[PDB]
Design an enzyme around this catalytic site. Structure first.
Site, PDB file in Angstrom:
ATOM      1  N   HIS A 255      -4.511  -9.094   2.115  1.00  0.00           N
ATOM      2  CA  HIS A 255      -5.862  -8.492   2.043  1.00  0.00           C
ATOM      3  C   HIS A 255      -6.618  -8.208   3.345  1.00  0.00           C
ATOM      4  CE1 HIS A 255      -9.710  -7.335   0.265  1.00  0.00           C
ATOM      5  NE2 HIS A 255     -10.296  -8.308   0.939  1.00  0.00           N
TER       6      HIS A 255
ATOM      7  N   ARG B 287     -14.302 -11.133   2.133  1.00  0.00           N
ATOM      8  CA  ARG B 287     -13.927 -11.103   3.546  1.00  0.00           C
ATOM      9  C   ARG B 287     -14.099 -12.487   4.169  1.00  0.00           C
ATOM     10  NH1 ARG B 287     -10.545  -6.626   4.030  1.00  0.00           N
ATOM     11  NH2 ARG B 287     -11.373  -5.287   2.359  1.00  0.00           N
TER      12      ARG B 287
ATOM     13  N   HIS C 276       0.801  -1.235   0.000  1.00  0.00           N
ATOM     14  CA  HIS C 276       0.000   0.000   0.000  1.00  0.00           C
ATOM     15  C   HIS C 276       0.835   1.287   0.000  1.00  0.00           C
ATOM     16  CE1 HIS C 276      -4.090  -1.475   0.053  1.00  0.00           C
ATOM     17  NE2 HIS C 276      -3.794  -2.337   1.009  1.00  0.00           N
TER      18      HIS C 276
ATOM     19  N   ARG D  30      -3.507   4.400  -0.100  1.00  0.00           N
ATOM     20  CA  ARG D  30      -3.433   4.584   1.359  1.00  0.00           C
ATOM     21  C   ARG D  30      -2.093   5.176   1.791  1.00  0.00           C
ATOM     22  NH1 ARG D  30      -6.110  -0.429   2.997  1.00  0.00           N
ATOM     23  NH2 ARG D  30      -7.956   0.425   1.942  1.00  0.00           N
TER      24      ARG D  30
ATOM     25  N   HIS E  95      -4.973 -13.027  -3.663  1.00  0.00           N
ATOM     26  CA  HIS E  95      -4.979 -11.847  -2.775  1.00  0.00           C
ATOM     27  C   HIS E  95      -5.870 -11.976  -1.535  1.00  0.00           C
ATOM     28  CE1 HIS E  95      -4.481  -7.796  -1.326  1.00  0.00           C
ATOM     29  NE2 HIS E  95      -5.777  -7.567  -1.452  1.00  0.00           N
TER      30      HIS E  95
ATOM     31  N   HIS F 244      -6.926  -3.542  -4.952  1.00  0.00           N
ATOM     32  CA  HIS F 244      -6.494  -2.160  -5.225  1.00  0.00           C
ATOM     33  C   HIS F 244      -5.782  -2.022  -6.568  1.00  0.00           C
ATOM     34  CE1 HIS F 244      -7.465  -0.068  -1.346  1.00  0.00           C
ATOM     35  NE2 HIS F 244      -7.684  -1.334  -1.041  1.00  0.00           N
TER      36      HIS F 244
HETATM   37 ZN   LIG Z   1      -4.849  -4.250   1.327  1.00  0.00          ZN
HETATM   38 ZN   LIG Z   2      -7.022  -5.988  -0.551  1.00  0.00          ZN
END
Ligand SMILES: [Zn+2]
Ligand SMILES: [Zn+2]
Length: 298
Positions: free
Chosen positions: A255, A234, A12, A48, A202, A78
């Protein structure tokens, strides 16, 4: 001696975290083992954090710096969305339009302020959400893409990002894989050393649905899907599913914003894109966790 496998969690845009982790890994692993290691980056290189451009530069440099390593770059959700915005995603193989992916989430458009600039009509849903202006903390968009735009020297949501991103970076994004499959890795267990297959993805794999069918769409990069659960899921992608939970398959993901080890299920995302959290890697076969915040020596 078994090959060293390094699985690196979500970066990130945190160049300092990436660099320090890479530095620490070289004291945790002896030079001979490190030189020939299989290195799997688990996705989410952008957003981020402040330095996406530098992160991608660093990742591009690794084949040159370490010519005997194998480098695998997973697409995170992302990075998929970033690629979508840059128009790097192939048109859906079923002949549908990229715009067809919008309908399922059409009610979210106003609050998320989807991108409407140059090339939006032929853009995947996630690309439009990624470059969107979320209504008012989020960095520009629901994906926190503001910091990615700024790392390439353009304002958030600007079509000029398409010109600002170097050709090498676009090539990097194109070369990302949605899944990696390795026939043979070694992993320490409570009973001893085992040889296993490895699947890197991921977020994870879904329950119930045929595993091979899932792997097929990931291998082929199916862009007809509005939200790819294998990248964005999730709870639905947390566990190793039915057909693979037989202690012969390592399933590794980033993730989830947690570091979680449960036998063959490896979730490596201690960072979560937070500025104050470490980026962790797992080293196989030992299953040792190395962090950017470590102070290791050989
Ligand atoms: Zn992430
Ligand atoms: Zn992610």
């Amino acid at each position: 001696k078994p090959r060293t496998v390094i699985c690196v969690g979500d970066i990130h845009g945190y160049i300092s975290k990436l660099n320090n982790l890479w530095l620490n890994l070289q004291s945790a692993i002896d030079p001979s083992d490190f030189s020939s290691a299989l290195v799997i980056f688990l996705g989410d290189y952008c957003d981020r954090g402040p330095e996406t451009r530098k992160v991608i530069d660093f990742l591009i440099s690794l084949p040159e710096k370490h010519p005997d390593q194998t480098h695998v770059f997973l697409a995170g959700n992302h990075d998929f969305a970033f690629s979508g915005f840059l128009g790097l995603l192939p048109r859906p193989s079923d002949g549908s339009d990229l715009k067809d992916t919008w309908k399922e989430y059409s009610k979210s458009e106003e609050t998320e302020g989807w991108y409407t600039g140059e090339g939006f009509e032929d853009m995947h849903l996630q690309g439009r959400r990624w470059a969107g202006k979320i209504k008012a903390a989020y960095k520009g968009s629901i994906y926190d893409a503001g910091s990615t735009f700024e790392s390439y020297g353009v304002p958030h949501g600007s079509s000029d990002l398409m010109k600002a991103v170097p050709e090498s970076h676009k090539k990097f994004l194109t070369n990302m894989v949605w899944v990696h499959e390795e026939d043979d890795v070694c992993i320490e267990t409570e009973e001893g050393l085992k040889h296993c297959k490895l699947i890197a993805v991921h977020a994870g794999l879904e329950k119930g649905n045929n595993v091979e069918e899932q792997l097929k769409l990931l291998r082929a990069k199916d862009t007809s899907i509005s939200k790819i659960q294998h990248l964005s899921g999730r709870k639905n992608v947390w566990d190793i599913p039915q057909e693979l939970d037989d202690k012969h398959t390592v399933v590794v993901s980033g993730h989830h914003g947690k570091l979680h080890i449960d036998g063959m299920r490896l979730i490596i995302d201690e960072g979560g894109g937070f500025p104050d959290k470490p980026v962790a890697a797992i080293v196989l076969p030992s299953k040792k966790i190395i962090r950017d915040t470590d102070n290791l020596s050989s």
